[PDB]
Every structure is written in structure tokens, then in C-alpha cells.
Amino acid sequence: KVDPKDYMFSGLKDETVGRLPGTVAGQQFLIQDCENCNIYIFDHSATVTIDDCTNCIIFLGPVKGSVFFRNCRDCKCTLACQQFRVRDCRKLEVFLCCATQPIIESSSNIKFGCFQWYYPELAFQFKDAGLSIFNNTWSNIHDFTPVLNWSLLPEDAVVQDYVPIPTTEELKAVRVSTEANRSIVPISRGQRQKSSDESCLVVLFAGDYTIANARKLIDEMVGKGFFLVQTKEVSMKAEDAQRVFREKAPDFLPLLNKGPVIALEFNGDGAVEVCQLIVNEIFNGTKMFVSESKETASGDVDSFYNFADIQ
């Protein structure tokens, strides 16, 4: 029996509360008028609203639609969602995975870091919510009321300083890691400042092992000291392929119909040559686009996001 009473936390002060996997299953959640609380929703949701909360610590599992904060202050959060909205809030710190551009309004001191979190059930919770781990624009904030009102968290932030793992016997049954290498969402730098002006685009096409290949390639590049700037998972038409891949397009055209492509953007000096080498050594006989040169890589990237931001 599903009833709205079981899908809310309201009017609490100085408590830890939460939801175990399977316990929400895509339903809708409300957190309202809580002060000094720690709240852990270890499941996928349709939408979550957080109203009038103060000094709270919040984990939200994959949200299929929108997360809305209204009238909250001094909360620290880790969450994944399709859309993110902050209205009339102050001093929020968020480790975010968001499929669209995060939006703030009438708010100040809003700080953003990349989602960094793992537990065994998380990957299927993302699939059930229809959220790709590769669609994350956590740092590209739009402020509806400029007067600057947001910034990025420090890059070396230890998640456990902001959003501690739960202690309680109930919530312990969930096997959490907040280590960067365990994170279900790949750590991307987004709009963080760059020390290299060399980029490299990789596009992987739909297939048995495409996601695992993308993870392996990120691991290889990042272990060599290259930066993962951003990723994407989108359907690609012949037109889009022609603009991005240029003369290499015809080799890849037969692969587009099978399903969404995965784009990876890397950053660092020698990124293009290094990436091509890793792709040759480790994925012989798997078709993969890699930027041809440093000169052309930035246009690869811009052409990709151009079509990908539309669809």
C-alpha cells in the first residue's frame, strides 16, 4: 500500500532519517521544515522537493525528473537528477550529477562539486531513473538573478567532510564508498580552469561493452595525468557524424543506428597522441572516433556539444 505519509520527512529537528533501496522505487518524495537533520534516500525517485530546511545533510539517489530546493539554508548535499532548481536558498554545498544545466534563483553562496558516491544498487537505480552516468553538466550553472552567487567547491574536497556516510544500524546495511575511484559517476572537471589548451574528443558507438570501454579509457587517461573534462550519451544522426568526424564519418555511419553514442572529452598536453595510442593498443578491432590532431580537436568538441545540447 503506497500512501503519501510514507514519502515525506517533515518538522524534524536534530535527527538522522533515511530510505533503503527498493523502498521508494520511483515514487515522489518531500523533505520539509527539517532542522539539523541528516537524511539519506538510498533509492531512485520521480521528483524530490526540499522545502524550508536548515543545517541538513542530504543524500538523494537518482531522480528521474526534477529536484527543487525552496527556502533552504546551510545544507550539504549529494544528488543525481535530470533537472536541478534552487530558489531562495543560502549557503548550499552540492555534489551534483545533473543531465541539464543547474538553475539557481534568488540565492547566494551556492557551491557545486561533481557527484562522487557508490553503493551496489546505485547503477541500476540510475538505469531505472533513466539517467545516464555520462550526462552530467554539474558546473555550468545558470543564475536567474545575477547581482557572483555561486562557485565551484574545492576540487580536492573529501566528500565525507560535507556529506558523511550514515552511522545508524538501519542505514549501515547499504555498502557506501565516497572514494573518487569507486564513484558510479566518472569525476569530470567541467568548467574548472584549465592549464592545458589541448583537447581530445573520443566517441564510442553502441555495443556490448561500450560503457566498460568508456570507463577503461577514462581510467587509462586519468592515470596518465590527463583530465576528463566532460562526457555525453546521445543519439547521433548521419548529419552530426559528418560535422564532428568530417572525412572519417563514412567509417562510423553504419554504427549510429544501433543506439546512443558515448562522447568523452580529455584535456592535457599530448592528449590526442596519447589517446590515439591507448585506443590502438587496448581496443584493436573496435571502431572508435578519436580527434585527428590538437588543432582540430577543439572543433570536434564544439561540433559534438552543438548537436548534443539540442537533443
- The verdict on whether residue 84 carries a ligand-binding annotation is yes
Around Cβ 89, how many Cβ atoms within 10 Å?
23
Q: Which three cell numbers stand for residue 234?
A: 546521445
* CATH superfamily entry for domain 194-311: Nucleoside diphosphate kinase-like domain (3.30.70.141)
Q: How far is residue 131 from each of residues 49, 93, 260, 279, 290, measured CA to CA in Å?
A: 18, 22, 13, 27, 25
110: phi then psi, degrees, rounded to nearest 5: -95, 120
**At CA 257, angle to CA 292 and CA 63, rounded to 5?**
95
What does R_g of the chain's alpha carbons equal in angstroms?
A: 20
Chain centroid, CA 286 distance in Å: 26
- The verdict on whether residue 83 carries a ligand-binding annotation is yes
Instruction: Give resolution in angstroms.
Output: 2.1
Check: CB of residue 292 under 8 Å from CB of residue 189.
no
Nearest to 235 by CA among 203, 208, 259: 259
- The verdict on whether residue 65 carries a ligand-binding annotation is yes
1-193 CATH fold: Pectate Lyase C-like (2.160.20)
List, in sequence order, every residue forming a beta bridge with 95; answer none if it has no partner.
78, 113
- The verdict on whether residue 85 carries a ligand-binding annotation is yes
Which residue ranges make up each domain of the chain? Answer: 1-193, 194-311
Residues 310, 134, 190, 93, CA torsion sign: positive
Residue 265 to residue 217: CA distance in whole angstroms? 11
Residue 199 to residue 201: CA distance in whole angstroms? 7
- Amino acid identity for residue 152 in this structure: L
- The verdict on whether residue 66 carries a ligand-binding annotation is yes
- According to the 3-state scheme, what is the secondary structure of the chain? CCCHHHHEEECCECCEEEECCCCCCCCCEEEECCECCEEEECCCECCEEEECCECCEEEEEEEEEEEEEECCECCEEEEEEEEEEEECCEEEEEEEEECCCCEEECCEEEEEEECCCECCCHHHHHHHCCCCCCCCCCCCCEECCCCCCEEECCCCCCHHHCCCCCCCHHHHCCCCECCCCCCCCCCCCCCCCCCCCCEEEEEECCCCCHHHHHHHHHHHHHHCCCEEEEEEEECCCHHHHHHHHHHHHHHCHHHCCCCCEEEEEEECCCHHHHHHHHHHHHCCCCCEEECCCHHHHHHHHHHHHHHHHHC
Residue 194 to residue 20: CA distance in whole angstroms? 39
- The verdict on whether residue 242 carries a ligand-binding annotation is no
